[PDB]
Amino acid sequence: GYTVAVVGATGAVGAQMIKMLEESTLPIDKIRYLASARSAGKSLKFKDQDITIEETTETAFEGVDIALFSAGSSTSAKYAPYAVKAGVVVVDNTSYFRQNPDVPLVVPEVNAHALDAHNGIIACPNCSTIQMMVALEPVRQKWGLDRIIVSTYQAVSGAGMGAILETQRELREVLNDGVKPCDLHAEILPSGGDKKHYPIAFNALPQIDVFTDNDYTYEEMKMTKETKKIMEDDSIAVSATCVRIPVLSAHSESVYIETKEVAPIEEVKAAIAAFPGAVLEDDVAHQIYPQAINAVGSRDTFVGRIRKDLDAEKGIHMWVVSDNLLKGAAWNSVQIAETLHERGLVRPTAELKFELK
Amino acid sequence: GYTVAVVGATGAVGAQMIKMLEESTLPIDKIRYLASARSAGKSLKFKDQDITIEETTETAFEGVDIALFSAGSSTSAKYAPYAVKAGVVVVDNTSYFRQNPDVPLVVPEVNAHALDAHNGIIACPNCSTIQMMVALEPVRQKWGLDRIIVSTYQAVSGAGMGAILETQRELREVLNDGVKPCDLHAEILPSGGDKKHYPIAFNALPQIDVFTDNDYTYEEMKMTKETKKIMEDDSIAVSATCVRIPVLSAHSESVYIETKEVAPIEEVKAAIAAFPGAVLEDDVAHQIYPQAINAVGSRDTFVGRIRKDLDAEKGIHMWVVSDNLLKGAAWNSVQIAETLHERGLVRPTAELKFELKLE
Ligand SMILES: NC(=O)c1ccc[n+]([C@@H]2O[C@H](COP(=O)([O-])OP(=O)(O)OC[C@H]3O[C@@H](n4cnc5c(N)ncnc54)[C@H](OP(=O)(O)O)[C@@H]3O)[C@@H](O)[C@H]2O)c1
Ligand SMILES: NC(=O)c1ccc[n+]([C@@H]2O[C@H](COP(=O)([O-])OP(=O)(O)OC[C@H]3O[C@@H](n4cnc5c(N)ncnc54)[C@H](OP(=O)(O)O)[C@@H]3O)[C@@H](O)[C@H]2O)c1
Ligand SMILES: O=C(O)CCCc1cccc(C(=O)O)c1C(=O)O
Ligand SMILES: O=C(O)CCCc1cccc(C(=O)O)c1C(=O)O
Ligand code: NA
Ligand code: NA
Numbered sequence: 132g133y134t135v136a137v138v139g140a141t142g143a144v145g146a147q148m149i150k151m152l153e154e155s156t157l158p159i160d161k162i163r164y165l166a167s168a169r170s171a172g173k174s175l176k177f178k179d180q181d182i183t184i185e186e187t188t189e190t191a192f193e194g195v196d197i198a199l200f201s202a203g204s205s206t207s208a209k210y211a212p213y214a215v216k217a218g219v220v221v222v223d224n225t226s227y228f229r230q231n232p233d234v235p236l237v238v239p240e241v242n243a244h245a246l247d248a249h250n251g252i253i254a255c256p257n258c259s260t261i262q263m264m265v266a267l268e269p270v271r272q273k274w275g276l277d278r279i280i281v282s283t284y285q286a287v288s289g290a291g292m293g294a295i296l297e298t299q300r301e302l303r304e305v306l307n308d309g310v311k312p313c314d315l316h317a318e319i320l321p322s323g324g325d326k327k328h329y330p331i332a333f334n335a336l337p338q339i340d341v342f343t344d345n346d347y348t349y350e351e352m353k354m355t356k357e358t359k360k361i362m363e364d365d366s367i368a369v370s371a372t373c374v375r376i377p378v379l380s381a382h383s384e385s386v387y388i389e390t391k392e393v394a395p396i397e398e399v400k401a402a403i404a405a406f407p408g409a410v411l412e413d414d415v416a417h418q419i420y421p422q423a424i425n426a427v428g429s430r431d432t433f434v435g436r437i438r439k440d441l442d443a444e445k446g447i448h449m450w451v452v453s454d455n456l457l458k459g460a461a462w463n464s465v466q467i468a469e470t471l472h473e474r475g476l477v478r479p480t481a482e483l484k485f486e487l488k
Numbered sequence: 489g490y491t492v493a494v495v496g497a498t499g500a501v502g503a504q505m506i507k508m509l510e511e512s513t514l515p516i517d518k519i520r521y522l523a524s525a526r527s528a529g530k531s532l533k534f535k536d537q538d539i540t541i542e543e544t545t546e547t548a549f550e551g552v553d554i555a556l557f558s559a560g561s562s563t564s565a566k567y568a569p570y571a572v573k574a575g576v577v578v579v580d581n582t583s584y585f586r587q588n589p590d591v592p593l594v595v596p597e598v599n600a601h602a603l604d605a606h607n608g609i610i611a612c613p614n615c616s617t618i619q620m621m622v623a624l625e626p627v628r629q630k631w632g633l634d635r636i637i638v639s640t641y642q643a644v645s646g647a648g649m650g651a652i653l654e655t656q657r658e659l660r661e662v663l664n665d666g667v668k669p670c671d672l673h674a675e676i677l678p679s680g681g682d683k684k685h686y687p688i689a690f691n692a693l694p695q696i697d698v699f700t701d702n703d704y705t706y707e708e709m710k711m712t713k714e715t716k717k718i719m720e721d722d723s724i725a726v727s728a729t730c731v732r733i734p735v736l737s738a739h740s741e742s743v744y745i746e747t748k749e750v751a752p753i754e755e756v757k758a759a760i761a762a763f764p765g766a767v768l769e770d771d772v773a774h775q776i777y778p779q780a781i782n783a784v785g786s787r788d789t790f791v792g793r794i795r796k797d798l799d800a801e802k803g804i805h806m807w808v809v810s811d812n813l814l815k816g817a818a819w820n821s822v823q824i825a826e827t828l829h830e831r832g833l834v835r836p837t838a839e840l841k842f843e844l845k846l847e
Contacts, residue, residue, distance in 0.1 A: 278799065282639035282742035284692045284731065303663050306656060312781040327775045334781045335641045335733060335740045337793050337807045342772045346795045355798060368799035372742040372807070374641065376692060377734045383692045385639035385729040385742075415699045418684045424669040424691045436694050438703040441712060442635065442725035450694045450729070 132160030133477065135468075136195045136219075138187055138210065139202030140164035140175060143292045144224055147461035148199050153178055155465050157197075157472060165191060166202065192217040196477055199464050200224060212487050215251035218479030220471060222253050222464045226349075229254045229357060233484045236360045238463065239470045240408045241268045246470060251480035253467055258459025259283050259350065259373065259382055260357040265432040265458065266451045267388065269406035270399055271362060275391025277445065278368035281354060284376050284383040285339060286423065287320065287331060289455050294319050294331075295379055301332035302377070321375055331377055339373040348373060381423035382459060384451045393445055396437060403434050408458070413437050421452035429454060430462045489515035490834065492825075493552045493576075495544055495567065496559030497521035497532060500649045501581060504818035505556055510535055512822050514554075514829060522548055523559065546846050549574040553834055556821050557581060569844050572608035575836030577828060579610050579821045583706075586611045586714060590841045593717050595820065596827045597765040598625045603827060608837035610824055615816025616640050616707065616730065616739055617714040622789040622815065623808040624745065626763035627756055628719060632748025634802070635725035638711060641733050641740040642696060643780065644677065644688060646812050651676045651688075652736055658689035659734070678732055688734055696730040705730060738780035739816060741808040746800060753796055756804065760791050765815070770794050778809035786811060787819045 135152065139145045145166075152159065162177045164184045171186035185191060187206060192198060192214040200207045201224040211221045211228070228234040235245035236254045241264050246253060256264070263281060270276065287298045297319045304310040315330035321338040329336060339350035347355075351371040359365045404411035412421050413435035421433035432453040440446025453459055471477050492509065496502045502523070509516065519534045521541045528543035542548060544563060549555060549571040557564045558581040568578045568585070585591045592602035593611045598621050603610060613621070616638075624633060644655045654676050661667040672687035678695040686693055696707035704712075708728040715726045761768035769778045770792035778790035789810040797803025810816060828834050 280637060280744055280797075282729075284641070284733065299663060302659060306660055306663065313784070321775070325775060329775075329779065330781060332781075333735050333737075334779055335735060335809075336779065337740075337742075337777050338775060342775075345798075346772050346793075347798075368797075370744075370798045370800075370803070370805060372639075372793065372805055374740075374742065376641065378690050378692060380690075383694070383731075385694075385731065387637055387727075415703055418678070418682060418686075418695060418699075420694050422686065422691055422693065424687060424689075427670075436703075436729065440725075441702075441704070441727045443727075446727070448727065448729055452692075 132158035133196040134161040134163065134194055135159050136163040136165055136192065136198040138165040138198055138200045138206065140184060141166045141170045142201060143288050143295065144201035144456055144460045147456040148201060148464065149177065151457070151461045151465040155469060157469060163195065189213045192219050195219045197222065197468050199468065201460065209488050211252055212485040215480055215485055216483055216487070220251055220477050222255060222467050224255045224460050224464055226257065226353060228252050229256065230360070236357060237467055238264045238361055239466050240265055240406065242361055242363070243470050246474060246476055249476060250482065250484045252485065255460065255463050255467065256357045256361060257350070257353045258289055258455040259285065259384065260354050260361070261459050261463055262382060262432045262451050262453035263354070263384060263386060264358065264361050265406070265408045266386065266403060266434045266449065269402040269409065270388065270390065270394060273402055274394035276367050277389045277391055279358065280370055280387040282372045282385045283374055284378070285373060286378040286380050286382055286455050287375060288380050289382070290320060290323065298331050298377060298379065301330055305332050331375055333377065336375040337372065339375055378423050380454060380456060381426040381452055382455045383421070383423055386449050386451055388447050389443060389445045390447065394447065396439055399447060400437050408432055409434055411435065421450055423452055426452045426454050430457050432458055489517035490553040491518040491520065491551050492516050493520040493522055493549065493555040495522045495555055495557045495563065497541060498523045498527045499558065500645050500652065501558035501813055501817045504813040505558060505821060506534065508814070508818045508822040512826060514826055520552065546570045549576050552576045554579065554825050556825065558817065558821070566845050568609055569840070569842040572837055572842060573840055573844065577606070577608055577610070577834050579612060579824045581612045581817050581821055583614065583710060585609050586613060587717065593714060594824055595621045595718055596823050597622060597763065599718055599720070600827055603831060603833055606833065607839070607841045609842065612817065612820050612824065613714045613718060614707070614710045615646055615812040616642065616741065617711050617718070618816055618820055619739060619789045619808050619810035620711070620741060620743060621715065621718050622763070622765045623743065623760060623791045623806065625719070626759040626766065627745065627747065627751060630759055631751035633724050634746045634748055636715065637727055637744040639729045639742045640731055641735070642730060643735040643737050643739055643812055644732060645737045646739065647677060647680065650680070655688050655734065655736065658687055662689050688732060690734065693732040694729065696732055735780050737811055737813060738783040738809055739812045740778070740780050743806050743808050745804050746802045747804065750802055751804060753794055753804070757794055765789055766791055768792065778807055780809055783809045783811050787814050789815055
């Protein structure tokens with residue numbers, strides 16, 4: 132069996148990493164929980180076992196077979212390369228290594244083949260991107276993809292435990308104390324690292340992550356660049372608008388595509404239904420469509436509102452929802468680890484391709 | 489001055505119609521508040537005056553110059569024609585008359601010209617459509633519009649007072665009592681008239697109004713059909729996805745357009761800023777963009793996140809926000825009434841062009 136380390140075990144994603152590992156088939160002989168110095172020494176459960184949280188350091192990965200990193204880009208940048216040096220296979224939830232050509236960027240249902248040539252780090256994509264890939268890959272396979280326009284409806288847990296608590300506090304101030312939403316004080320959303328913070332309570336914030344030089348945010352650009360890498364097609368046109376709404380868990384997306392060939396809607400629905408990881412929830416006669424509150428806790432990605440554009444021959448609209456902490460993060464990561472296991476890819480990497488920092 | 493009736497004075501739009509009329513320049517000599525049998529006999533303020541609410545009837549409109557209808561499509565269907573027969577000019581907030589070729593469908597900044605040939609009923613468009621037209625008309629004027637793709641983020645007050653109360657109740661049960669969102673009981677949303685109801689708390693519901701036979705909802709098709717009528721151009725391709733989110737007031741929209749000619753983004757920003765009713769809130773260096781919570785209470789429509797598409801030469805994305813009860817409803821209606829006054833258009837229509845529904 133394996134020694135598995137969870138780096139960032141105490142955070143929003145870390146908690147779901149724990150749950151997904153507890154529910155995994157992976158043969159785990161030893162579990163280790165790693166975090167920052169301030170969590171080191173506390174106890175956290177794995178099933179019935181009490182695990183003592185350890186501080187994350189350059190020398191903490193000896194004996195580890197698989198390390199699941201969800202502690203922030205800076206933590207991955209600093210320590211993942213030392214984990215690889217120590218013989219670990221790293222599955223990284225952060226954005227840091229995603230565009231490195233030596234790093235596979237994987238959604239197992241779409242591009243598991245990219246795992247075979249790994250150099251010790253496999254990157255989990257952005258949550259918003261992952262669910263969109265699960266919905267669209269079965270369409271791309273049969274009729275191609277020319278372009279995507281997506282507008283997202285993103286849950287606050289994507290921004291971490293602090294953002295969840297900020298959202299809850301803000302809502303209670305409005306509902307219980309009668310504070311006007313525009314008068315609330317915020318410290319985290321829309322982006323912890325950016326200069327100004329705004330209320331999310333009763334709001335829709337069109338900013339996720341920080342702005343890039345082209346006036347799209349880094350979240351929007353991740354959707355663009357990660358799609359192209361995952362689907363191995365730089366020709367796919369992708370533009371995104373990423374919006375935070377007052378939902379704690381599960382991202383929803385209004386997705387428009389144009390296919391390369393006309394894709395009859397009944398066949399599109401069937402192709403999505405048949406695709407592993409995708410569940411068709413589409414029966415408008417009974418008001419059946421994907422819903423954030425229904426997706427919470429499920430590893431599947433739910434797709435509905437599927438319909439032809441009113442004018443564009445090859446245009447199709449749909450609604451895609453998944454739990455952003457599960458398929459969008461912890462489940463995608465555990466599924467990668469399970470796929471590595473299946474393929475006999477859990478083993479030390481001989482060549483070090485990642486500079487030690 | 490005028491005798492003005494507000495039909496549906498007691499609901500979510502009605503409260504804002506009252507506020508907008510209190511703050512209006514319209515010379516009002518008399519106010520009457522009309523609603524259903526349920527509210528008849530109750531009292532409601534106009535400024536410092538107590539106004540007794542009346543049941544809406546066939547015979548309620550004698551002496552009325554202007555009637556603002558916001559009581560539901562059936563109520564407009566039943567009583568607006570009798571108002572017109574009585575000599576009233578009706579401003580109707582409902583969908584009922586919007587696609588009637590005898591009825592102007594007006595956003596005053598865009599197509600006030602359509603008011604001149606009115607036949608006693610002027611229709612206010614759907615709230616989601618109105619704010620989109622305010623944002624896009626200045627772009628259309630300079631560079632044309634070939635298509636629109638819109639995904640909306642709609643506040644619950646668009647579904648009425650009941651939906652507001654339902655949303656607050658649900659949120660309190662979750663936040664204060666620890667109820668799981670999927671265990672919530674809903675009675676109204678997504679659509680009061682439809683068969684099944686779902687929680688909105690911590691949810692996003694991709695259904696506004698009921699489904700039509702092409703699998704778009706009526707809300708989505710309204711954005712399509714109303715845009716084409718308001719802009720007087722059937723060739724504009726419009727497809728919409730309309731979604732309810734946990735916001736009480738102000739609708740937000742992610743709007744994609746393709747223009748006919750390449751529209752430089754800095755010029756687009758300037759054209760929108762310069763257009764009456766539109767305010768540019770677009771300074772990403774200081775994280776300035778429209779926000780529902782800032783839009784509440786303002787008659788203006790706020791536009792930002794303006795940027796070219798990453799691939800389509802003539803593609804532009806933006807973010808549009810307005811208070812759905814103000815520019816989306818009560819303010820657009822009062823602004824129509826003020827525009828009718830400016831143009832000498834508040835007077836009886838001699839020829840009745842609308843079916844009377846009460847034999
Ligand atoms: N805000 C604080 O002052 C504070 C205090 C204690 C803990 N934290 C951690 O950070 C989060 C605070 O809210 P959040 O929204 O930021 O959490 P979050 O994004 O949901 O989770 C961040 C996770 O990354 C870990 N992490 C952060 N820096 C690290 C480092 N240098 N080395 C190894 N692991 C690291 C955290 O462990 P740690 O828990 O050890 O940080 C935590 O498990 C907590 O979940 C908690 O995990 C923060
Ligand atoms: N332009 C837009 O986008 C827009 C936006 C929102 C609403 N609207 C229109 O306005 C309507 C009402 O919206 P709301 O949000 O104010 O709804 P609401 O909060 O539910 O209020 C409904 C109003 O309609 C009145 N009413 C109901 N049945 C009636 C009847 N048989 N006769 C006379 N009055 C009656 C109610 O009176 P009681 O209190 O006596 O029941 C109340 O004043 C909607 O159905 C829609 O057509 C348009
Ligand atoms: O808004 C959301 O739904 C969450 C986005 C996830 C996220 C949050 C902070 C930092 C990073 C990052 O590693 O850059 C990432 C990421 O791209 O995975
Ligand atoms: O819910 C929203 O945010 C927008 C829908 C407003 C609305 C609600 C019920 C009935 C009608 C209607 O008159 O059909 C209308 C309308 O189109 O004005
Ligand atoms: Na302006
Ligand atoms: Na005049």
